[PDB]
Amino acid sequence: DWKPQILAIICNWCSYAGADLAGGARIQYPPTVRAIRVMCTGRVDMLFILKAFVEGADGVLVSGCHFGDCHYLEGNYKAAKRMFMIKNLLRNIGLDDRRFRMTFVSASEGAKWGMVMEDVTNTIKELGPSPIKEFKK
Amino acid sequence: SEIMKYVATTCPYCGVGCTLNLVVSNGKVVGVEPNQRSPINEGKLCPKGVTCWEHIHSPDRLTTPLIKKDGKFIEASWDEALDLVAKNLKVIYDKHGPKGLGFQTSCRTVNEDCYIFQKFARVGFKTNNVDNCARICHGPSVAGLSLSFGSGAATNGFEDALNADLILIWGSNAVEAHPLAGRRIAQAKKKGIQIIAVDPRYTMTARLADTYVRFNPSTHIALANSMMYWIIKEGLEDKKFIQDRVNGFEDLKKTVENYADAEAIHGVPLDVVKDIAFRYAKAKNAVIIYCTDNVRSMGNLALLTGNVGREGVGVNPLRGQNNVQGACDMGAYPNVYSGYQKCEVAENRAKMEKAWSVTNLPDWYGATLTEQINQCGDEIKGMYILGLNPVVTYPSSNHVKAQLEKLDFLVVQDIFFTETCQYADVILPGACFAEKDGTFTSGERRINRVRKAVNPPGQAKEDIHIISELAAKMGFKGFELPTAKDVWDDMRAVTPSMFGATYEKLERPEGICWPCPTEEHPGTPILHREKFATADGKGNLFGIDYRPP
Amino acid sequence: AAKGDMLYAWAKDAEIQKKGECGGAVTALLKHALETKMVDAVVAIKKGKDLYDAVPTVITNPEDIIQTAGSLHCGTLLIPKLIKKYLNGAKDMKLAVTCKGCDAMAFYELAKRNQINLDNIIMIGVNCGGSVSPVTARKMISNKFGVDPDTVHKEEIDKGQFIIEYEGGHKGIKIDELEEEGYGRRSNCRRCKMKIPRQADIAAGNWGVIGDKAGKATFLEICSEKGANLVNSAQSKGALEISPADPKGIDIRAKVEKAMFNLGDEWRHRDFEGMGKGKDRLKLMMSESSKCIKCYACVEACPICYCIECSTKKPWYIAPGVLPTSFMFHLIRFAHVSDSCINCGQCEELCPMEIPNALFMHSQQVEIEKMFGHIPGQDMTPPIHAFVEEKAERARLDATGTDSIYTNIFT
Numbered sequence A: 001d002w003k004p005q006i007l008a009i010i011c012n013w014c015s016y017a018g019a020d021l022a023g024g025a026r027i028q029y030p031p032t033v034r035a036i037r038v039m040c041t042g043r044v045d046m047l048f049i050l051k052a053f054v055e056g057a058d059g060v061l062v063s064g065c066h067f068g069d070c071h072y073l074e075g076n077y078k079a080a081k082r083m084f085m086i087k088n089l090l091r092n093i094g095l096d097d098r099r100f101r102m103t104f105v106s107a108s109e110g111a112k113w114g115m116v117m118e119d120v121t122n123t124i125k126e127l128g129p130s131p132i133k134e135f136k137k
Numbered sequence B: 001s002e003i004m005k006y007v008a009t010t011c012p013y014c015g016v017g018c019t020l021n022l023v024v025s026n027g028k029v030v031g032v033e034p035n036q037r038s039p040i041n042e043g044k045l046c047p048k049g050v051t052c053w054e055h056i057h058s059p060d061r062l063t064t065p066l067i068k069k070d071g072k073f074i075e076a077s078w079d080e081a082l083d084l085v086a087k088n089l090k091v092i093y094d095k096h097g098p099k100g101l102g103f104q105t106s107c108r109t110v111n112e113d114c115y116i117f118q119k120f121a122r123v124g125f126k127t128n129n130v131d132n133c134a135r136i137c138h139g140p141s142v143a144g145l146s147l148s149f150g151s152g153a154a155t156n157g158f159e160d161a162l163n164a165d166l167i168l169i170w171g172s173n174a175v176e177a178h179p180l181a182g183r184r185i186a187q188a189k190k191k192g193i194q195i196i197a198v199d200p201r202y203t204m205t206a207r208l209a210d211t212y213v214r215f216n217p218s219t220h221i222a223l224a225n226s227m228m229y230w231i232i233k234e235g236l237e238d239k240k241f242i243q244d245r246v247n248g249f250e251d252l253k254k255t256v257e258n259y260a261d262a263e264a265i266h267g268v269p270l271d272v273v274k275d276i277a278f279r280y281a282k283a284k285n286a287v288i289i290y291c292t293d294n295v296r297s298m299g300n301l302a303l304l305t306g307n308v309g310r311e312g313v314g315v316n317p318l319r320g321q322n323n324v325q326g327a328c329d330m331g332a333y334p335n336v337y338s339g340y341q342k343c344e345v346a347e348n349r350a351k352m353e354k355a356w357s358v359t360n361l362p363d364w365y366g367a368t369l370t371e372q373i374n375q376c377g378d379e380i381k382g383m384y385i386l387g388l389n390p391v392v393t394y395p396s397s398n399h400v401k402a403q404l405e406k407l408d409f410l411v412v413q414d415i416f417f418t419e420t421c422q423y424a425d426v427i428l429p430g431a432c433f434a435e436k437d438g439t440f441t442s443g444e445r446r447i448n449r450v451r452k453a454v455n456p457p458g459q460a461k462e463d464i465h466i467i468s469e470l471a472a473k474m475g476f477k478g479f480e481l482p483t484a485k486d487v488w489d490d491m492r493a494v495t496p497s498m499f500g501a502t503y504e505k506l507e508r509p510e511g512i513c514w515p516c517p518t519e520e521h522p523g524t525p526i527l528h529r530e531k532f533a534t535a536d537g538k539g540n541l542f543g544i545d546y547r548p549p
Numbered sequence C: 001a002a003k004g005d006m007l008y009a010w011a012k013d014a015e016i017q018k019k020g021e022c023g024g025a026v027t028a029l030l031k032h033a034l035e036t037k038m039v040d041a042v043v044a045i046k047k048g049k050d051l052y053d054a055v056p057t058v059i060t061n062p063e064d065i066i067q068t069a070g071s072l073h074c075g076t077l078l079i080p081k082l083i084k085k086y087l088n089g090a091k092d093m094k095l096a097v098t099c100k101g102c103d104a105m106a107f108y109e110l111a112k113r114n115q116i117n118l119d120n121i122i123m124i125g126v127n128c129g130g131s132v133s134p135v136t137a138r139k140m141i142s143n144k145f146g147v148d149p150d151t152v153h154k155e156e157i158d159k160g161q162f163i164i165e166y167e168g169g170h171k172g173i174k175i176d177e178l179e180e181e182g183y184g185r186r187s188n189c190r191r192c193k194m195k196i197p198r199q200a201d202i203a204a205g206n207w208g209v210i211g212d213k214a215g216k217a218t219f220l221e222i223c224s225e226k227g228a229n230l231v232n233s234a235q236s237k238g239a240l241e242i243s244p245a246d247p248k249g250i251d252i253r254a255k256v257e258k259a260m261f262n263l264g265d266e267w268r269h270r271d272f273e274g275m276g277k278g279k280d281r282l283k284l285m286m287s288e289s290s291k292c293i294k295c296y297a298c299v300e301a302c303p304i305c306y307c308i309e310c311s312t313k314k315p316w317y318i319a320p321g322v323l324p325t326s327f328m329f330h331l332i333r334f335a336h337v338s339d340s341c342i343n344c345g346q347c348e349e350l351c352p353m354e355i356p357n358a359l360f361m362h363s364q365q366v367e368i369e370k371m372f373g374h375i376p377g378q379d380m381t382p383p384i385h386a387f388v389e390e391k392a393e394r395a396r397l398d399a400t401g402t403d404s405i406y407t408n409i410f411t
């Protein structure tokens, strides 16, 4: 009756390329994550993550370039600081902060993208349904 | 001149009467600030109070009198417009007596303007055709609660419900309308007080409640009759109270004993009915918050459980307009002079005559708003409308327009060019709450001060000034009142209660509650202290049968 | 006299020195600045009514500051946001403003976000041990003290007790006892730790004044060159008397400040664990925030909320007409403010629905602080998201010892 709802927000220049490379190489993984594709992860506002979690994302993933490998010289440092602060907010509002993570996937790491997909799915399955969906009523 | 000056005032948007600071810079109201000193709201305001300052300096505000001269309104001088009004009112009087005229004010207006308006309507041409919004507004509940208790006002205050165990909201959207009355419900549930909501729909004030009860709309009589049936059946009524201060119990007995199983009418299962009935009857101090037969059933419940004359208890029907209570108090009804002194009794009729230096007061029951509008051509012709927009407010707006165009010499006083203005023959510009200097009266009977922040936009004047100038034009003695304080003092001389409510006492942030008969009395925050206000001093509880529509 | 000096100061004018809560040095300095034309106006607090009513006032006539003299402990208001809204952010006119610790922190937050001109504003800071809501003070005096509140002449929090002076005598009750019974200082004042505003230009208080001047001298700490100039000018023109402070006074001032820090820590603890942990904290937060009627008083009163249009007003975040509003309303404030919340309490105390906005926000702020090391309201340090740094970002990723942002971040 329950299937995890995981949302990914992946940059165009390394994480979308890595997911595309995994697909091209035919690396299988479970069909639980759906992606959004912004240009950089610097674009990811905090309110995007919080909006996802309040609509009912059982998990949220944000994937971007490695440090020093952003297409736009430093846009993922901003995203990293923002996601550290988001981890702190979710812990202090009492939602489980491991529902959220930020992975750094390069353009050539299709295998690592597959492993990230598998691990995110496993972690959210262990965690269970998000509590917001029943706390709203 | 002045930079960021704070002026304390009452919010004009509903009957809670919250206090707020208007910020006035160079004679312009530039914002609203909290007033943390106020007992009613401790600096807290709803969206309406937060943005009450926006409409003050709009360009659309009427600035100078207008006269309909064979078409579109042209700009007139105060002397010209007032001489025209005096002439036309004089001729309509001299042709058709006091029945020919018709007055109605709004509940938006300050007490001093309501009092001087009804004084103008009665001291001159003796007509009781004076009225206000409260008729067409939601509640004629004042008459029902008056029949039950003696005073149609709310028995207790707002802070008072913090002392109950069983706040019982009934059919009220107390957080949508009167949000800072619903703040008391929020504080009570934080204190851990049983709260039962009974509205037909799951409202945001029904969220706060421990128990929520659906019922089919238009079944309050049936549901309350069932609750009183179970209270009687298990004998949780208050014997000392009923035997000492209440009358009519046998009539209630017959009337309710036919409501054992009323699930057909109201949707509430018998289990839930018994639950709420026994929680209410067992609570030692339980307060009902309500929002004619419908309010007398509430009076029946409170009297049956002996929940009236004490702290932490009572019935609090929420009003909805900022000064509806004040207008009714000042005597803008057909049948009451002021302080609910009936005109049917020659005693205070003669007292009015002696005090006002006028003779032969009407004594007949006047015409309410809808009465006037329906007979607006048959015998009424000539109408002063102090702040109403009937064409937009009454149902059957096209019928309202037809009746108003059937009318000779409508006069309209407003701050804005409304839709009713096109049908006027004279339009006298007015002042809003930021230019007046009067008092409001909350729904909890508290008189609050309104303070002057700015000046009226152009040549506009405030209503005491307009009515005094018109009465001086028409040759009426008794309108020599240059300030709201003088109007208030005349009213106080007239009325037995409110005699203690001097402005030196209203300058306190606490205000004064209405039954204040002497100058050392602190006020009466809780009514019916140990005796009621009816003929035997005893509340009467009635037996209402439910009428299916 | 020079940026660090600790002094005793009292007014030369005997009437100013009587009406001052201590020696009248804040009212002598403000009067001098106004009448020698350092500043074009003065924003101070005066009583509008009974001493429970504190009304902010812009004063240009030097003759009206004797009315501002005295400290109102029921003045729970915040000044800097009024200067931005109705004095054009002090962008053209110099002002001299008397401010508490929260009012100094708010000045610095708004100056970080470019909403006021601290080059124009002079901040005379006062020590603050806490403020009481006026109506709560009234109920306190009616019930616990057994006095009619209209009888009180003056009332102060001195030595951790609530002294009131009425007709008949004076009384005193420990503020800790009152705070247990459900009264006392505001919640955020109990949690506050900004006791001596060393970020202001002058810090005035009654702590550290000992001996023959225990009630007729103000302890002044000169915290900047601008304050040193104001003080030296006032002393030379002879509006203010200056004597070097007593070393024993300095020591016990430090001890009282430290004890107030410890008490603030204790209240921070008991409050933040009172909110709960895990899904219980989410049900507390969500059930409380379901009461919000969207009055926006918290947004309009917050010093950190400077946005022309709040994102809480944008239809793609919050549905315009749905009144049982989403938790997104308060998530958008936790995200935008919690990194720099000065714990002023305005959001909590102006809420018609009595939602613990300040408690929630400060509970998040304290550990955003121990995470990033950013203390709000102390100086011109840019907000954490307005200044991201390459080396620091590397540092926090390496400290997690991990290839992502997933775990090993908290203890």
Ligand SMILES: Cc1cc2nc3c(=O)[nH]c(=O)nc-3n(C[C@H](O)[C@H](O)[C@H](O)COP(=O)(O)OP(=O)(O)OC[C@H]3O[C@@H](n4cnc5c(N)ncnc54)[C@H](O)[C@@H]3O)c2cc1C
Binding pocket: C019, C020, C021, C022, C023, C024, C025, C026, C027, C030, C044, C045, C046, C054, C068, C069, C070, C071, C072, C073, C074, C075, C076, C077, C098, C099, C100, C126, C127, C128, C129, C130, C131, C157, C204, C205, C206, C207, C218
């Ligand atoms: C709420 C409050 C709590 C305080 N608690 C302490 C304490 O625990 N320990 C301590 O040593 N000192 C405390 N102080 C400061 C104490 O009053 C100083 O000793 C005093 O300000 C010294 O100034 P003065 O007497 O020389 O000048 P004053 O003539 O007293 O000048 C006082 C100045 O403060 C302004 N003011 C008054 N009320 C407020 C207010 N609510 N907010 C902002 N400004 C205001 C007045 O307008 C005036 O300009 C507190 C002050 C306040 C307002």
Ligand code: SF4
Binding pocket: B011, B012, B013, B014, B015, B016, B017, B018, B041, B045, B046, B047, B048, B049, B050, B178, B179, B180, B181
């Ligand atoms: S609760 Fe009523 S009186 Fe108070 S601010 Fe809101 S609308 Fe005005």
Ligand code: SF4
Binding pocket: C100, C101, C102, C103, C128, C129, C130, C131, C188, C189, C190, C192, C193, C194, C195, C343, C344
């Ligand atoms: S928040 Fe701190 S500085 Fe501000 S009034 Fe309260 S105790 Fe004083």
Ligand code: SF4
Binding pocket: C291, C292, C293, C294, C295, C296, C297, C298, C299, C347, C350, C351, C352, C353, C354, C355, C357
């Ligand atoms: S002040 Fe309170 S009620 Fe108003 S918007 Fe903020 S949280 Fe909601």
Ligand code: SF4
Binding pocket: C301, C302, C303, C304, C337, C340, C341, C342, C343, C344, C345, C346, C347, C348, C357, C358, C361, C362
């Ligand atoms: S969120 Fe509340 S407590 Fe925090 S700074 Fe803003 S107003 Fe002050």
Ligand code: SF4
Binding pocket: C299, C304, C305, C306, C307, C309, C310, C311, C312, C332, C333, C336, C337
């Ligand atoms: S909550 Fe955020 S968007 Fe809204 S006013 Fe505050 S800082 Fe601006």
Ligand code: FES
Binding pocket: A011, A012, A013, A014, A015, A039, A040, A041, A042, A063, A064, A065, A070, A071, A072, A075, A076
């Ligand atoms: S381009 Fe991918 S994180 Fe910036």
